[PDB]
Nucleic acid binder design. Structure first.
Lengths: 124, 180, 262
RNA sequence: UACCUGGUUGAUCCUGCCAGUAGCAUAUGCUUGUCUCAAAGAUUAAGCCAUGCAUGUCUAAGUACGCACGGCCGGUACAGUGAAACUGCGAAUGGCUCAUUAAAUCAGUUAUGGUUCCUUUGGUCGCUCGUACUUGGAUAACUGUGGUAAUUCU
RNA sequence: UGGUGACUCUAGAUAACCUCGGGCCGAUCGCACGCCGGCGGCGACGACCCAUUCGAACGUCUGCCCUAUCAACUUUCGAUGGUAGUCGCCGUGCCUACCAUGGUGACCACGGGUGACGGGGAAUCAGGGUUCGAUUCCGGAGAGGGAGCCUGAGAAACGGCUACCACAUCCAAGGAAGGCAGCAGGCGCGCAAAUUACCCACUCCCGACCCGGGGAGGUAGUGACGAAAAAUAACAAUACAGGACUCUUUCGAGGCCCUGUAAUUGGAAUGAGUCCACUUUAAAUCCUUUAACGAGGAUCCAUUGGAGGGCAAGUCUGGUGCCAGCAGCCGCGGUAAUUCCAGCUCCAAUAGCGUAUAU
RNA sequence: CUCUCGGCCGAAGCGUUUACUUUGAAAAAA
């Protein structure tokens, strides 16, 4: 394996029930490493499953030697679902956001503003 | 209101007299000797040296035991020594006024790449740096105007991924080898 | 403007928060509370910018709403709650106590204290007055009101408050020769022994203070916070003991530390 | 970089201005490969505006007999989720613009011992010598009847 | 009782008042469960009052552009002060009634003008200055123009109301409804300025609130305002030229150096571009990172101004002939025009350069 | 001198005043 994972900064955040760290990925001849295999490498590195690992913000340095990102390893998947941002859970398939747009919601709200009572639910 | 910063600064100054034969000749000599793209590179290095001289002059008007003179002169001299423009022996603010533009021009990455034998000419040095063939320590540097520090001078190598420094022949060589 | 303001621009925020300029347009406007807006550190800045326990304001809220953060012995869920000088921040989940104490640069240091020290705090009494049929009352810089204080306690003294019960357990008078910190002005965060108090009736009294290294400065009386009787503090001090090195000595110390490594 | 040059005369030395010279800021013209920042209906018209959006809000903890979903068929009032509506809070912040405005605004400096202050925080809250194991009437939501061409009308 | 430099302060005592438009002294909600009818733990919410915080308001001292073709102004239409009150949150001609006759001014009052919001600041600048500051931070003001209010702690609020003035929408003609100097967008104006886009992920704000909302804000789109970095080639051989104490002249000591019309010859090297997978990010884009293709007129083509002087660069060729034009200024043009119109060449800056205007 | 002098410590004074000069406070950020 020619791709290396190191964790410079690291702290056990007991307040948010996780460990948080900065991840260096050495990949001299490859593209920026996909988040999933960084997650499995971190899972081997910290003896846990890759479903409680959330990596993000990976920037590859000019030249191509290495990529630096941030990573969280939660105590359980339940703490991960409780504390993680909804988009980072959606990247794992654990969350789905509203399929409506801001425009549709705003105009529906302003339309409901024109009716009084139970008829508000009978709008749109 | 925006979360943006508008701190920006012009890095050169245009000469007062546009068509002056002596200045045109001096600038063209610098351009040709150091492989510069245009007159703005000369004017940029001139502006850098001018600001350094202005700071040194303003420090030389303070008392020799002035805390600010001591602190900021020491910092300025340390900065000039760090990039090799000043020698460690001349750690006085009076020696700043004796510095030339060529002193700063030697410390460009292009000049050092040419002078360390990595390139056949200063123009070859510039095109080598612009084509991601050169690295300082482990960082592939791509900017010809990169001012080499004193302790970065011995770490200018030929890039571990360039065809000249570690393999993977280039587009042309691979295509020609495929052809025959 | 009509009525009160509710926002704080990031660049109009106090500089000792050490907020950068590109994160956003706004700074967390401190809530009203014990300490003034410019003399406080909001809980979000402490838990996110200083301790790095959170990356965003959402995570600061997530921490605070689990009731993990105590300020002066009480759980606070307001992430912009104004925590100020001498305030004790307890995080029992991680088992760490801090006391908000100024640096020699005028910034609130991350100063960790023992759980025994986290039981009390020093408070500079702001005023003494009689009310409620002869009952004496005392008001501190922390804005806590204490009934029946010791008759010897006067304005500008320092009392020790047991956070569990919130009553005075000891006090230092404002006397020449007592250790004090500076809580405002150019000398903010400096610790030294009070040398003399020049009184200006109808104006601001000036207090002269001498460092432990022999450096003498002066502040207004409103900026003086008596710390200990004599030259012995009643609280733990940060790594810098209130001695403000000049920039030359800071440079020398940094260079010596750097050259000792490698 | 503490800098000048051309032009009055047949020629000269001046006064002296015109012109040149460099930046800066708007507009405009020609041209424009890469990449990072980044201003942008101020100037004339604080002129006029189609349309859409820009301020809403619920916790274990004010009021749930909307079957709208939903159970454990009961001296079991109220399981729970919960539209609506009442109540509370916000809407006086933010954003925009520079018309007004010449000790006015504003800046530094002081004062409020001449005032008000939601909220936050701390204190006070059996300190009053004179159906309570909980008092009264309404009104929303909801049901039902309607008016006007027309409204977030009622 | 305590405090202040200073109270007609704070606290105390007495005699009473104690507002129907009447003030405090809890008829509230959740969780956990208990204890030989009683006693309870942890909270949520609410109400005086006093501090505190956030302020607001009103005063102090000093500081503001041009103007004398503005030299006197104000004076119970309160002007300056006094006394008493009214009103106001409070000090006060804030207003009222009596009383006095004051108050400001060449140290520039008063009046007028301002293509005048003030400041932090910006441009330029040897020293000194000059000009600018509508503009993201602070303070003020306004919401078409005035005026008046309701609610509220806080508004004389305008994404609140009431009226008038101007403009204007629907109408079944009876009535009803308006306020983009918010974000986009349109018209108009002009020399002069962008999308009717995406999102609350960030920064923060608001709410009963860990959960909702935010055209604040963030993200993209347009963008040569402006600023930073930085390609448009590099190298070698060949023929040629030049020097190199080359012999006090002709390739018999002239290739361990250097230059160029070289549409000469060669290989190398590349990213502009296209495209793939990551990465980025709410989601994307961009940058970075792989990979694939991608350069020899490397036609993958650099322009904008100029060539008399000032002022860098041709009295070269053709045309025109005081015409057309150039020319900031001096001047050029009337048949050899170094100045016009063109070709060639050159040179100034260069992804930028010219012009107008203000400074 | 210091109308408090006590067997090294403090109630020890803009001592007509101002301008000036040198301090020291206090004075947003950008």
């Amino acid at each position: 394996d020619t791709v290396t994972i190191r964790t410079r900064k690291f702290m056990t955040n007991r307040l948010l029930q996780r460990k948080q760290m900065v991840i260096d990925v050495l990949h001299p001849g490859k593209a920026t490493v996909p988040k999933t295999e960084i997650r499995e490498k971190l899972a081997k590195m910290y003896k846990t499953t890759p479903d409680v690992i959330f990596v993000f913000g990976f920037r590859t340095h000019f030249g191509g030697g290495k990529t630096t990102g941030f990573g969280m390893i939660y105590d359980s998947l339940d703490y991960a679902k409780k504390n993680e941002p909804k988009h980072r859970l959606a990247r794992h398939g654990l969350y789905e956001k509203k399929k409506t747009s801001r425009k549709q919601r705003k105009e529906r709200k302003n339309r409901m503003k024109k009716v009084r009572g139970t008829a508000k639910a009978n709008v749109g | 209101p925006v979360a943006r910063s508008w701190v920006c600064r012009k890095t050169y100054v245009t000469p007062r007299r546009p068509f002056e034969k002596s200045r045109l000749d001096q600038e063209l000599k610098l351009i040709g000797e150091y492989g510069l793209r245009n007159k703005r590179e000369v004017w940029r290095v001139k502006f850098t040296l001018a600001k350094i001289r202005k700071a040194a002059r303003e420090l030389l008007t303070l008392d020799e035991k002035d805390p600010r003179r001591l602190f900021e002169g020491n910092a300025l001299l340390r900065r000039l020594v760090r990039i090799g423009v000043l020698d460690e022996g001349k750690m006085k603010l009076d020696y700043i006024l004796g510095l030339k533009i060529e002193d700063f021009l030697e410390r460009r990455l292009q000049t050092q790449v040419f002078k360390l034998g990595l390139a056949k000419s200063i123009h070859h040095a510039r095109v080598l740096i612009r084509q991601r063939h050169i690295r300082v320590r482990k960082q592939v540097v791509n900017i010809p105007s990169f001012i080499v520090r004193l302790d970065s001078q011995k770490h200018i190598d030929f890039s571990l991924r360039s065809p000249y420094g570690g393999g993977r022949p280039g587009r042309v060589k691979r295509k020609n080898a495929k052809k025959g | 403007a009509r009525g009160p303001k509710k926002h704080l621009k990031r660049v109009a925020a106090p500089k000792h928060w050490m907020l950068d300029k590109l994160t956003g347009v706004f700074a967390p406007r401190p809530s009203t509370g014990p300490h003034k807006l410019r003399e406080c550190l909001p809980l979000i800045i402490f838990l996110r910018n200083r301790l790095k326990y959170a990356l965003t304001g959402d995570e600061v809220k997530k921490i605070c709403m689990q009731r993990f953060i105590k300020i002066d012995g009480k759980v606070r869920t307001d992430i912009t709650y104004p925590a100020g000088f001498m305030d004790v921040i307890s995080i029992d989940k991680t088992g760490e106590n801090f006391r908000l104490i100024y640096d020699t640069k005028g910034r609130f240091a991350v100063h960790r204290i023992t759980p025994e020290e986290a039981k009390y705090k020093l408070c500079k009494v702001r005023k003494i007055f009689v009310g409620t049929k002869g009952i004496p009352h005392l008001v501190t810089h922390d804005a806590r009101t204490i009934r029946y204080p010791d008759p010897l306690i006067k304005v500008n003294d320092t009392i020790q408050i047991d956070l569990e019960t919130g009553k005075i357990t000891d006090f230092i008078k404002f006397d020449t020769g007592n250790l004090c910190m500076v809580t405002g002005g150019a000398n903010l965060g400096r610790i030294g022994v009070i040398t003399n108090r020049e009184r200006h009736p109808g104006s601001f009294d000036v207090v002269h203070v001498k460092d432990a290294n022999g450096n003498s400065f002066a502040t207004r009386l409103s900026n003086i916070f008596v710390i200990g009787k004599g030259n012995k503090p009643w609280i733990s001090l940060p790594r810098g003991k209130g001695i403000r090195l000049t920039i030359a000595e800071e440079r020398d110390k940094r260079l010596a530390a750097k050259q000792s490594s490698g």
